[PDB]
Motif scaffolding. Structure first.
Motif, PDB file in Angstrom:
ATOM      1  N   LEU A 103      59.227 -72.256  53.728  1.00  0.00           N
ATOM      2  CA  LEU A 103      59.379 -71.691  55.068  1.00  0.00           C
ATOM      3  C   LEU A 103      60.788 -71.912  55.604  1.00  0.00           C
ATOM      4  O   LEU A 103      61.372 -71.011  56.215  1.00  0.00           O
ATOM      5  CB  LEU A 103      58.318 -72.256  56.004  1.00  0.00           C
ATOM      6  N   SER A 126      50.679 -72.359  48.365  1.00  0.00           N
ATOM      7  CA  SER A 126      49.693 -72.638  49.403  1.00  0.00           C
ATOM      8  C   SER A 126      48.293 -72.724  48.810  1.00  0.00           C
ATOM      9  O   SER A 126      47.485 -73.554  49.220  1.00  0.00           O
ATOM     10  CB  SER A 126      49.759 -71.545  50.473  1.00  0.00           C
ATOM     11  N   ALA A 130      45.690 -76.004  48.638  1.00  0.00           N
ATOM     12  CA  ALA A 130      44.289 -75.959  49.043  1.00  0.00           C
ATOM     13  C   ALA A 130      43.393 -76.529  47.951  1.00  0.00           C
ATOM     14  O   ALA A 130      42.435 -77.248  48.234  1.00  0.00           O
ATOM     15  CB  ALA A 130      43.915 -74.511  49.356  1.00  0.00           C
ATOM     16  N   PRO A 140      40.880 -77.951  52.777  1.00  0.00           N
ATOM     17  CA  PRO A 140      41.861 -77.073  52.127  1.00  0.00           C
ATOM     18  C   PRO A 140      42.661 -76.245  53.099  1.00  0.00           C
ATOM     19  O   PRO A 140      43.737 -75.768  52.719  1.00  0.00           O
ATOM     20  CB  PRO A 140      41.015 -76.193  51.195  1.00  0.00           C
ATOM     21  N   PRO A 144      45.927 -73.600  61.389  1.00  0.00           N
ATOM     22  CA  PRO A 144      46.229 -72.164  61.327  1.00  0.00           C
ATOM     23  C   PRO A 144      47.618 -71.843  60.808  1.00  0.00           C
ATOM     24  O   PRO A 144      47.820 -70.766  60.241  1.00  0.00           O
ATOM     25  CB  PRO A 144      46.052 -71.692  62.777  1.00  0.00           C
ATOM     26  N   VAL A 145      48.598 -72.715  61.040  1.00  0.00           N
ATOM     27  CA  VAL A 145      49.993 -72.342  60.810  1.00  0.00           C
ATOM     28  C   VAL A 145      50.736 -73.479  60.135  1.00  0.00           C
ATOM     29  O   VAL A 145      50.749 -74.605  60.636  1.00  0.00           O
ATOM     30  CB  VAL A 145      50.698 -71.967  62.131  1.00  0.00           C
ATOM     31  N   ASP A 146      51.377 -73.173  59.015  1.00  0.00           N
ATOM     32  CA  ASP A 146      52.306 -74.102  58.404  1.00  0.00           C
ATOM     33  C   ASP A 146      53.699 -73.854  58.969  1.00  0.00           C
ATOM     34  O   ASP A 146      54.072 -72.707  59.214  1.00  0.00           O
ATOM     35  CB  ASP A 146      52.294 -73.884  56.896  1.00  0.00           C
TER      36      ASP A 146
ATOM     37  N   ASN B  52      40.725 -71.044  62.694  1.00  0.00           N
ATOM     38  CA  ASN B  52      42.066 -70.659  62.288  1.00  0.00           C
ATOM     39  C   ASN B  52      42.290 -69.170  62.495  1.00  0.00           C
ATOM     40  O   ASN B  52      43.389 -68.767  62.888  1.00  0.00           O
ATOM     41  CB  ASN B  52      42.294 -71.007  60.817  1.00  0.00           C
ATOM     42  N   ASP B  55      42.768 -68.302  66.035  1.00  0.00           N
ATOM     43  CA  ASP B  55      44.165 -68.597  66.349  1.00  0.00           C
ATOM     44  C   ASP B  55      45.100 -67.512  65.819  1.00  0.00           C
ATOM     45  O   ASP B  55      46.019 -67.094  66.524  1.00  0.00           O
ATOM     46  CB  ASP B  55      44.567 -69.963  65.790  1.00  0.00           C
ATOM     47  N   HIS B  56      44.904 -67.060  64.570  1.00  0.00           N
ATOM     48  CA  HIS B  56      45.781 -66.026  64.018  1.00  0.00           C
ATOM     49  C   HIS B  56      45.755 -64.770  64.871  1.00  0.00           C
ATOM     50  O   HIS B  56      46.801 -64.142  65.100  1.00  0.00           O
ATOM     51  CB  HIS B  56      45.373 -65.668  62.592  1.00  0.00           C
ATOM     52  N   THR B 116      59.142 -66.561  60.535  1.00  0.00           N
ATOM     53  CA  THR B 116      58.672 -67.909  60.218  1.00  0.00           C
ATOM     54  C   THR B 116      57.234 -68.101  60.677  1.00  0.00           C
ATOM     55  O   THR B 116      56.412 -68.669  59.951  1.00  0.00           O
ATOM     56  CB  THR B 116      59.574 -68.967  60.847  1.00  0.00           C
ATOM     57  N   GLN B 119      54.865 -65.847  58.448  1.00  0.00           N
ATOM     58  CA  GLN B 119      54.754 -66.473  57.132  1.00  0.00           C
ATOM     59  C   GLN B 119      53.873 -67.709  57.183  1.00  0.00           C
ATOM     60  O   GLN B 119      53.146 -67.998  56.226  1.00  0.00           O
ATOM     61  CB  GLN B 119      56.155 -66.869  56.643  1.00  0.00           C
ATOM     62  N   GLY B 120      53.966 -68.475  58.269  1.00  0.00           N
ATOM     63  CA  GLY B 120      53.160 -69.675  58.406  1.00  0.00           C
ATOM     64  C   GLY B 120      51.679 -69.389  58.531  1.00  0.00           C
ATOM     65  O   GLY B 120      50.852 -70.227  58.147  1.00  0.00           O
ATOM     66  N   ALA B 121      51.312 -68.237  59.108  1.00  0.00           N
ATOM     67  CA  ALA B 121      49.920 -67.798  59.129  1.00  0.00           C
ATOM     68  C   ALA B 121      49.485 -67.284  57.765  1.00  0.00           C
ATOM     69  O   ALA B 121      48.380 -67.600  57.316  1.00  0.00           O
ATOM     70  CB  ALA B 121      49.721 -66.709  60.178  1.00  0.00           C
ATOM     71  N   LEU B 122      50.337 -66.511  57.083  1.00  0.00           N
ATOM     72  CA  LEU B 122      50.043 -66.087  55.714  1.00  0.00           C
ATOM     73  C   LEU B 122      49.699 -67.281  54.836  1.00  0.00           C
ATOM     74  O   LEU B 122      48.762 -67.227  54.037  1.00  0.00           O
ATOM     75  CB  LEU B 122      51.255 -65.362  55.136  1.00  0.00           C
ATOM     76  N   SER B 123      50.479 -68.361  54.954  1.00  0.00           N
ATOM     77  CA  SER B 123      50.203 -69.580  54.198  1.00  0.00           C
ATOM     78  C   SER B 123      48.784 -70.069  54.462  1.00  0.00           C
ATOM     79  O   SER B 123      48.070 -70.483  53.539  1.00  0.00           O
ATOM     80  CB  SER B 123      51.231 -70.645  54.584  1.00  0.00           C
ATOM     81  N   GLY B 124      48.359 -70.011  55.725  1.00  0.00           N
ATOM     82  CA  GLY B 124      47.006 -70.402  56.084  1.00  0.00           C
ATOM     83  C   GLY B 124      45.929 -69.501  55.506  1.00  0.00           C
ATOM     84  O   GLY B 124      44.941 -69.989  54.956  1.00  0.00           O
ATOM     85  N   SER B 126      46.223 -67.831  52.866  1.00  0.00           N
ATOM     86  CA  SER B 126      46.258 -68.094  51.432  1.00  0.00           C
ATOM     87  C   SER B 126      45.394 -69.299  51.082  1.00  0.00           C
ATOM     88  O   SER B 126      44.720 -69.314  50.054  1.00  0.00           O
ATOM     89  CB  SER B 126      47.707 -68.324  50.993  1.00  0.00           C
ATOM     90  N   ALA B 127      45.419 -70.329  51.929  1.00  0.00           N
ATOM     91  CA  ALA B 127      44.564 -71.493  51.739  1.00  0.00           C
ATOM     92  C   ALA B 127      43.100 -71.115  51.916  1.00  0.00           C
ATOM     93  O   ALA B 127      42.238 -71.565  51.153  1.00  0.00           O
ATOM     94  CB  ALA B 127      44.951 -72.608  52.705  1.00  0.00           C
TER      95      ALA B 127
END
Ligand code: MG
Ligand code: MG
Ligand code: ZN
Ligand code: ZN
Lengths: 270, 270
Positions: A103, A126, A130, A140, A144-146, B52, B55-56, B116, B119-124, B126-127
């Motif tokens: 990121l 990611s 998990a 896992p 919600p957000v990294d 999550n 939240d998204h 950013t 992408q941080g939600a996409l990471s979530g 993906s998990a």
């Protein structure tokens, strides 16, 4: 340029991770995993992680070359591996740290097509995170957000695995030890810096993906605040001149280190 | 602008997913999950996925408003839910489709800070996908790289869950049915289009994250080629004027639909 530097930084991250998984597959078998209570599919996925990380590394090398760059070589590593449990612990640690690394790097990568490829690898790391979370009894998908961290922050997370590098790699901050390293909101965490950092003016920085950085005077302890979700990165910063620590390390004085905030999906009875 | 449109498209995706998970948590309990062979932690993570995804969705609404946009409202949905197995099937389907949706949208999002967050939600997501894969016996990380699809491709994947929308949403292509919908390299997949598409000049498009689009004359069958890894999206395209179908739907005539390529980490004996 900054795109090349960001890619080379990610190549450093993936050199370390791929080296770990390649070596671990050579040293552990499915029978070792089964003796530890895991299933054949878990060993198979572990081999798949190795394969995926070899791809993540090799793809970065190829792309850097195609851009006229000089790909970083591997560093020399040390991994604290004894039993299967320790393999899973190192794996979880590496994959959790991938997310802020990618990121942060993506902030510096200039072209649409390159960002698509790199985001697509982040998605894969990611999924690895998990998997290792689930195998170690952690949610896992704990939030919600990294969020991002800087290159030096990532070096700080990785430093115990690096013996030496044959190039000027991002320099770590001193390690911040957290006791405990997991727990719920309200946990009082004893924080110890590897170097003698004067805490006058220091703030605990709780770096969250969903709420950004939360800052508070230490008690040396830091308390997990309400509202944050997901993995947390806890650092000492000097002052509050930097409000968004995940994108600016210019006030960081110790850490970050990871903190596994309790979340729905953690192992529980029944 | 295109940033706003991309965010509103993702809000459509997340309206659908969040609506599903909110309703499913209301209709299924931990005891239902345990009766199906799952653990308390799996139900807890399912509630966490709901949280999550709420939240998204809510984050996208807020961001669109802050940019002066008009956030899309929910559509009217239909979910094919009977037992716990069907809940997991729908969940896996939604989360697998999140990745190409977010990856495509990120091509259009202009600012560093916004990318950013997204992408941080996409990471979530993906998990989440890795969790549902594991619970359904599929590899949680079947390949190294997830790839993009277009907005209309995503609408095609989602179309069986949409009754109607109160705004002009991206239009789906006809559904492409795949039999079988999983298997290894070399699998001959019978492909049937929901509409009477003339296959003269049609190519099977095997859309992979790691190798891009591979195209071949149908047999109407499509054969899974070597070298691809991860989830595959199989479509019919007319001609080869478009080589990278994941970023240009202007030749797509049926599908895509997903195909779960066998991978290390799938459930296996022992
Ligand atoms: Mg990784
Ligand atoms: Mg999702
Ligand atoms: Zn990786
Ligand atoms: Zn989502």
């Amino acid at each position: 340029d900054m795109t090349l530097d960001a890619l080379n930084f990610l190549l450093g991250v993936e050199h370390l991770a791929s080296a770990f998984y390649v070596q671990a597959v050579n040293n552990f078998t499915a029978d070792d995993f089964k003796a530890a209570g895991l299933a054949q599919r878990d060993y198979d996925q572990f081999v798949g992680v190795r394969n995926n990380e070899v791809d993540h590394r090799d793809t970065l090398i190829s792309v850097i070359k195609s851009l006229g760059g000089k790909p970083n070589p591997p560093c020399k590593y040390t991994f604290p591996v004894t039993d299967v449990a320790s393999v899973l612990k190192v794996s979880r640690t590496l994959e959790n740290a991938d997310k802020p690394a990618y990121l942060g790097a993506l902030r510096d990568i200039k072209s649409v097509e390159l960002r698509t490829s790199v985001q697509g690898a982040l998605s894969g790391d990611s999924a690895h995170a998990a998997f290792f979370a689930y195998l170690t009894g952690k949610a896992p998908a704990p939030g919600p957000v990294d969020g991002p961290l800087t290159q030096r922050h990532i070096a700080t997370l990785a430093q115990d695995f690096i013996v030496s590098c044959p190039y000027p790699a991002p320099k770590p901050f001193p390690k911040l030890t957290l006791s405990p390293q997991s727990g719920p909101v309200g946990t009082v965490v004893a924080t110890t810096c590897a170097q003698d950092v004067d805490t006058n003016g220091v703030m605990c920085a709780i770096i969250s993906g969903n709420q950004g950085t939360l800052m508070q005077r230490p008690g040396a302890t830091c308390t997990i605040p309400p509202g944050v979700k997901g993995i947390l990165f806890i650092a000492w910063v000097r002052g509050r001149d930097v409000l968004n620590v995940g994108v600016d390390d210019s006030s960081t004085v110790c850490g970050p280190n990871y903190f596994l905030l309790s979340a729905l999906g953690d192992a529980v009875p029944g």
